[PDB]
């Protein structure tokens, strides 16, 4: 530190005294992030393991709100043949929130899954289900021949093929009106140019891949001016104490040391500031306790040395720090036989003004030579 003092004072000769040279700070180790426990899972399990399934003409719509959408539980299974999504990619839908979710579920033919593609116009893509001009979701589909196929077949599933005009978006028209044509209007009967819109599905093991029943669930995310309610899951790491780190508590970002406290916060209170309008204490979102934030240690660096003519022995003073953080606060990385010897050793003394290294504490009292603070003086003479 004699070299640092010479560089700061811009003089190779240093007079007897104390001089401030630089500053030291403590940096966060890696990071800390915390969030409340995830206990508001959306009821996707009921849809995944539904006992009864709805027909196309009665495709079922489900409202999803005020719950966390954890799609990883179904994504890791990878048991769905069709995993197409639009608006947001499946691997990056976690980092954005929506205020509502529509879940439309039905069972169709295996080759008709493409008919559920957004914006398609066709016999099934217009006359059974319609979609708006914007999509922010998925059109997931999977095979359902294991459960929906049984001996003897089923006739409770109907599809619409004939209708007057295209369906209005987000409408489920459950009607049995017979289609009529202007060339020959039956007007009350099912004669020429008049047929039932709905035909029954054919369930049998001999059906091919295209004819095999497939369960299709289309999910549509949506956000409006109203506050968002369906947010993706946020991972919270382990909580560390008595260590300087950059912490993120419920979106509040700070840097410092989190230490256990005895403050009794109100049940509705999350954090607590001080008179100076700075964050002081934080409640752990997962488990209930209060942690105070110490704004690191930092401080000033002062060099204690006599005149260069007298000798070259030097001492190091750190301001407002305990004698435990000195080897970590930007240290032990400089040149070894010069700086590393002035960070640790048996000459470390703790004073009210901070930590002093390079001087020996003696019970005797003499006239002050180099003042430090709080009635502390360093002298080169023994």
């Amino acid at each position: 530190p004699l070299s640092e003092t010479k560089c700061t004072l811009k003089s190779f000769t240093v007079e007897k005294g104390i001089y401030q040279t630089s500053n030291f700070r403590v940096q966060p180790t890696e990071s800390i992030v915390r969030f409340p426990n995830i206990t508001n899972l959306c009821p996707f399990g009921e849809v995944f393991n539904a006992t009864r399934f709805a027909s196309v003409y009665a495709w079922n719509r489900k409202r999803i709100s005020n719950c966390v959408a954890d799609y990883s539980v179904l994504y890791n299974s990878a048991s769905f043949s069709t995993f197409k999504c639009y608006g947001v990619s499946p691997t990056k839908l976690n980092d954005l929130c929506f205020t509502n979710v529509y879940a439309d579920s039905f069972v169709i033919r295996g080759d008709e899954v493409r008919q559920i593609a957004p914006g398609q116009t066709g016999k099934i893509a217009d006359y059974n289900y319609k979609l708006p001009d914007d999509f922010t979701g998925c059109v997931i589909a999977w095979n359902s021949n294991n459960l929906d196929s049984k001996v003897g077949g089923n006739y409770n599933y109907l599809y619409r093929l004939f209708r007057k005009s295209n369906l209005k978006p987000f409408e489920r028209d459950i009607s049995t009106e017979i289609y009529q044509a202007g060339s020959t209007p039956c007007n009350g009967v099912e004669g020429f140019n008049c047929y039932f819109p709905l035909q029954s599905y054919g369930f049998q093991p001999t059906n091919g891949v295209g004819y095999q029943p497939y369960r299709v669930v289309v999910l549509s995310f949506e956000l409006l001016h109203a506050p968002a309610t369906v947010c993706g899951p946020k991972k919270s790491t382990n909580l560390v104490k008595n260590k300087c780190v950059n912490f993120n508590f419920n979106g509040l970002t700070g840097t410092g040391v989190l230490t256990e406290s005895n403050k009794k916060f109100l049940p509705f209170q999350q954090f607590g500031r001080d008179i100076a309008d700075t964050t002081d204490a934080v409640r752990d979102p997962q488990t209930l306790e209060i942690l105070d934030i110490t704004p690191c240690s930092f401080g000033g660096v002062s060099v204690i040395t006599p005149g260069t003519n007298t000798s070259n022995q030097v001492a190091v003073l750190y301001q407002d720090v305990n004698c435990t953080e000195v080897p970590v606060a930007i240290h032990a990385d400089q040149l070894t036989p010069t700086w590393r010897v002035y960070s640790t050793g048996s000459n470390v003394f703790q004073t009210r003004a901070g930590c002093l290294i390079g001087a020996e504490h003696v019970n005797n009292s003499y006239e002050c030579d180099i003042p430090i603070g709080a009635g502390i003086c360093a002298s080169y003479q023994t």
Epitope: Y86, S89, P118
Partner: nanobody, 127 residues
Framework: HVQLVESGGGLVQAGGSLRLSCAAS????????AGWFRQAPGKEREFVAV????????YYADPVKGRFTISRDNAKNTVYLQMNRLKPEDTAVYIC????????????????????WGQGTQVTVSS
Amino acid sequence: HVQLVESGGGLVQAGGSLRLSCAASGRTFSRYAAGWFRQAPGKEREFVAVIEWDGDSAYYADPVKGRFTISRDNAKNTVYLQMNRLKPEDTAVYICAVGGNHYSRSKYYNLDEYDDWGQGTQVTVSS
């Protein structure tokens, strides 16, 4: 009724550049992911390129990797395929399809995963 029209094709000299424009007329063009495929006599049908709604991420086949560019324009409801450093082996009929966004690599070889099918345009190289 999203009508698809193809233009910009024809016969071009070797070593030049080409631009094939596929225009889709409809109210759901933005919801469609644009796929481009090629077909040549004596060769099996192979997937060429696919681009999403925003166009930031696009997927191209290995034989045509790093050789052609794809772009979109929602305001004009058009998609453009730029061929650079053209070769005589690229003389073929190109087809543009709109509808559905796919993420499976093995599912890009099927033309049944798109809503509407167009007519395509012929690209020929003169030596």
